[PDB]
Design a protein around this ligand. Sequence first.
Ligand code: FES
Ligand SMILES: [K+]
Ligand SMILES: [K+]
Ligand SMILES: [K+]
Ligand SMILES: [K+]
Ligand SMILES: [K+]
Ligand SMILES: [K+]
Ligand SMILES: [K+]
Ligand SMILES: [Mg+2]
Ligand SMILES: [Mg+2]
Ligand SMILES: [Mg+2]
Ligand SMILES: [Mg+2]
Ligand SMILES: [Mg+2]
Ligand SMILES: [Mg+2]
Ligand SMILES: [Mg+2]
Ligand SMILES: [Mg+2]
Ligand SMILES: [Mg+2]
Ligand SMILES: [Mg+2]
Ligand SMILES: [Mg+2]
Ligand SMILES: [Mg+2]
Ligand SMILES: [Mg+2]
Ligand SMILES: [Mg+2]
Ligand SMILES: [Mg+2]
Ligand SMILES: [Mg+2]
Ligand SMILES: [Mg+2]
Ligand SMILES: [Mg+2]
Ligand SMILES: [Mg+2]
Ligand SMILES: [Mg+2]
Ligand SMILES: [Mg+2]
Ligand SMILES: [Mg+2]
Ligand SMILES: [Mg+2]
Ligand SMILES: [Mg+2]
Ligand SMILES: [Mg+2]
Ligand SMILES: [Mg+2]
Ligand SMILES: [Mg+2]
Lengths: 164, 108
Amino acid sequence: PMKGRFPIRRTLQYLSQGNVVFKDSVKVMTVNYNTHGELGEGARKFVFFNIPQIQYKNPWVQIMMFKNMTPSPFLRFYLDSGEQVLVDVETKSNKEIMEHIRKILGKNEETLREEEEEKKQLSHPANFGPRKYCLRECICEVEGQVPCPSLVPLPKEMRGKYKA
Amino acid sequence: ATLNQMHRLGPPKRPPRKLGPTEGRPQLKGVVLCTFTRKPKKPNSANRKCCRVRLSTGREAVCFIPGEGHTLQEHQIVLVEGGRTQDLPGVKLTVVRGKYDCGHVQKK
RNA sequence: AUAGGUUUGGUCCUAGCCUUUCUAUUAGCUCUUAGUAAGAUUACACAUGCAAGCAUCCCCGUUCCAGUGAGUUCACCCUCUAAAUCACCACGAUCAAAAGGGACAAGCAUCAAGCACGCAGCAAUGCAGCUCAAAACGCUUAGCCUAGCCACACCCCCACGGGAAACAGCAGUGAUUAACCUUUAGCAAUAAACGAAAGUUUAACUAAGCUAUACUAACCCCAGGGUUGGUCAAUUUCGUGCCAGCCACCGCGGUCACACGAUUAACCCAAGUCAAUAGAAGCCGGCGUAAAGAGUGUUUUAGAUCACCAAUAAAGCUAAAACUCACCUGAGUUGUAAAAAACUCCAGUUGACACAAAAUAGACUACGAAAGUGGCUUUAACAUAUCUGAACACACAAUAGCUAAGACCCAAACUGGGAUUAGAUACCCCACUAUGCUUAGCCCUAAACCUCAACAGUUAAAUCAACAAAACUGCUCGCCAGAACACUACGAGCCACAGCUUAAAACUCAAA
RNA sequence: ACAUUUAACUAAAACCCCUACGCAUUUAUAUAGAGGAGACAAGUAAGUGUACUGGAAAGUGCACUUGGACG
Ligand code: FES
Ligand SMILES: [K+]
Ligand SMILES: [K+]
Ligand SMILES: [K+]
Ligand SMILES: [K+]
Ligand SMILES: [K+]
Ligand SMILES: [K+]
Ligand SMILES: [K+]
Ligand SMILES: [Mg+2]
Ligand SMILES: [Mg+2]
Ligand SMILES: [Mg+2]
Ligand SMILES: [Mg+2]
Ligand SMILES: [Mg+2]
Ligand SMILES: [Mg+2]
Ligand SMILES: [Mg+2]
Ligand SMILES: [Mg+2]
Ligand SMILES: [Mg+2]
Ligand SMILES: [Mg+2]
Ligand SMILES: [Mg+2]
Ligand SMILES: [Mg+2]
Ligand SMILES: [Mg+2]
Ligand SMILES: [Mg+2]
Ligand SMILES: [Mg+2]
Ligand SMILES: [Mg+2]
Ligand SMILES: [Mg+2]
Ligand SMILES: [Mg+2]
Ligand SMILES: [Mg+2]
Ligand SMILES: [Mg+2]
Ligand SMILES: [Mg+2]
Ligand SMILES: [Mg+2]
Ligand SMILES: [Mg+2]
Ligand SMILES: [Mg+2]
Ligand SMILES: [Mg+2]
Ligand SMILES: [Mg+2]
Ligand SMILES: [Mg+2]
C-alpha cells in the first residue's frame, strides 16, 4: 500500500479540497507550534493536515514552520504593505483555525466565482483551432456546411483539377 | 525505502538500451569476405551455412544464410537483418534472401 | 495487464528472458479505383533555371516569407524602458528590444571540491570573503514546454579580418544511407512588399504531378501475405533421416516428422501481409537463507513524534607446571600401533628458580559500542533525562602481517633428520626458526554472525509460502533491483607497494 | 598604446591605434609487445581471514564460525 500514516493527504483530491485562497496581500505565513502539550493539539493537526492544502492553493506564499520556540502556538501572516497579522491558535481545533484564517485573509466565494467567469471568457466557443484550445478545428465540422474533402469528396465542379 | 529517501534519490534512472549488431537499424548493407560453415552447439548437429561480411559501418561480422542452397561468393553485396541464430553462438545477423546478389531459394 | 510460456525427479518462493496489444521506418512478396493527409538518410558537394520588387527620380522593401536541427537552459513571469503602429498636439494604449530579479532538459559523484568564484565605502581604500553531497566545478547526450517557440544561415562561436567561393528557398543532381516526389502552372483566392490609386511582383501560397506511408469510400471481372507442436486460431499425403533444414521462448529432425522441403486442407488479416529495427507500457517492492542491515560508536545540516560479577588503562605481586643450576643415587632416557632417529653435559628424589600462561570456581551468563574480557592488590574509570543520524568526517577494531629494540619456558608456519609409500615437497617421531610475549609505531582484514539495522509500540487479526528465530505496526538511516564477467579492470584515497576501501563496462546465457 | 584642427555675410568640412598561437594545452586514433574474461570443446568434517612452502595440484601454522559428528 501507500507509505506513511494518512496517505490520503498525498492525493491531488485531498490537496485540492482546501478552501483557503489567500488574498494577494499575504506573502509569508509562519507557523509556530509545539510538538507536545494538549493545548496545542489542533495546531499540530493544522500542521499535519491543512498546511499541504494551503500551500497547494497558494503556491507563491512562503510557508515556514517553527517548533518549540514559544510556550504557545500562533500563526503570523506578513502582508505586502508591511502589516503583520497575529492569530492565537491555542485551544483551537484545526478546523477552527482554517475557518478563522479563511474569514480574516481568505478570498470570499464571490471573488473566486468572478475569477472563474473571467477565465471562462478566454476560451471563446466560437473560435476555431486545435483541440487543445478550441472546441472545433474547422467549420466543416458544423452540420449543414460543406464537409471535409477527406471524408466526403467534393463535386467535380468545385475542384480546381476539373475547373482548369 | 522511506519517502524521504525516495525524494532524495528521485525517479528511477533507466540505463540506455543496448544497441544490437545492427546498431539500432533495420538492415545493413555488407560485402561478403568469405563463406564457410559452422557447427551447432550440441543438443543439435548440422553444418550451418555462414559468411563473414564487412558491413557499411566498417565492422566485420558473421552472418547466417537461411534457406536451402546459396550462391554467395566473395566481393558480393548482401543485405543483413537482425535476429539471432539460436543454434550458433555469436551469430546475431541474418542475410536477407532476394536482395542484391543473394537470390531467393530455388523451388524444391 | 484479466495475463501467459520458460529453471526442478517433484512442490513452493524469488528472479530474469520471451509471448499476446498499438504505432513509425525499412526489407521480402503482392497490389484495382476515387478523395484527403504526409513525404532525402546526410549542417556532405552542387551543373542548370527561377525564388524581390515597387515607384514621377527621393525613399521604402529585399532584416519579411521560405529552409534546416549543427549548436544549445537567449524562449516563460515581473521591473524598467528603446525602436514600431495608432492617437500622431500629447495624455496614453498596443507591441516589443537592451538592462535588472525569478524560473527553466537528460545521464555520469569512478566529475568532490571550484580557485577569486564576495562584501563594505563618494572615492581613497578596508575586510577575506563567495559556490558546493539539498550536487558547485566538470564530461557526455539532446532542438524544445509544438495555435507555436529557440538556434543557425559554408567554415573560423562572432565576422573588422581570414579560409574560400557556399541550394539547411523551389525544382533538380552527384556521392552517401536500410532510407530515394515533378528541373508543373498561376498570381484567380489569402498573405507579404510598394504605390494616393487603378494596380505590379512573389517557387509564400493556390491548383496540379509522383509515392500503399496513413485515413475515408468503393469495386463490373479481379487476392495476396503469413501461419497451422505448446504459449496461440488452424495439416492430409509423400520426400529426407541429427543430413537437408526450422524456431519469438520452450524446442523439432536418428524410417509412423501434425515442428524441415513439396503437396492437400485449414486458420488470421487483407490491398495488403509482417521479417528486422525503434518506440509506446515499470520500482509506494524488498534486505536471516534467493540481490540487499555494508565489524563498532558519536555527531553535523536536518528529519521523526517514540520528547556488585570476566569493561578499559596503569603500576606492583604469585599459587601450580616448566626451563636452568647443585648434591645424592642409577645406566640408560626419549620416542609408539610398531620402529628408527635423538640424547646419554641422560634419567629419579630433594632444594633454589620467569618480561611465558593464568586448574578448580564456571552446571555461572556477567562487563564492554564492537573487537574482546575469567590469577591477586591498589589508583583512575565505564558519554547523553527525546529518538534517528556517515564506505569517506572523528574515534576504535580478533587472528595473521610489516618496521625498530628487548625477553624466550612452551608451542610452532618454514627448514632439516627418522619412518611409511609406487612416489610423500603431507599425515606419525625428533630438533629448530619467523611468529605467539613487552615497549614505540604501522597495517585495517574475518563465518568481525544472534547470518535478526536503531528507537517506539501491539498480541488483535487469515498467525503463517518454506525453513530458521511466534506474527506484526509506526518512524528513521543504510542498502538492493537476472546470472557471470567481478572480493575483477580503470579512476581516486590511504604509513599500506604481490596491500586495503570504493567499484564498472564489453563479449556470453536463459537461466542463476 | 593614443589625441581638436579648419571654419563661421545661410553653415559646414575634416576623423580610421598596435598586439596572440606556442618545444603551450585537451581529448582521441594507429601501431611493437604483454595479459585477461567469455564461447566452443571435452584417517585427517566443512568453511572465513591472514601468512609461509610449492611450478602447480595442494599442505601446514594462528584466531574465528556451525552453515558438521558426539547413541
Ligand atoms: S479540417 Fe475542415 S475541411 Fe478539412
Ligand atoms: K537434436
Ligand atoms: K517605393
Ligand atoms: K539540433
Ligand atoms: K555559427
Ligand atoms: K494573388
Ligand atoms: K515419412
Ligand atoms: K556464528
Ligand atoms: Mg516469470
Ligand atoms: Mg523442466
Ligand atoms: Mg511492404
Ligand atoms: Mg517610441
Ligand atoms: Mg530582454
Ligand atoms: Mg555519494
Ligand atoms: Mg572508472
Ligand atoms: Mg544534435
Ligand atoms: Mg550547403
Ligand atoms: Mg557564422
Ligand atoms: Mg532543394
Ligand atoms: Mg521513405
Ligand atoms: Mg512562375
Ligand atoms: Mg499537393
Ligand atoms: Mg511444415
Ligand atoms: Mg545473499
Ligand atoms: Mg550486522
Ligand atoms: Mg546518535
Ligand atoms: Mg553515504
Ligand atoms: Mg588490529
Ligand atoms: Mg605482532
Ligand atoms: Mg566474534
Ligand atoms: Mg544505524
Ligand atoms: Mg549506516
Ligand atoms: Mg547482476
Ligand atoms: Mg582490488
Ligand atoms: Mg588456511
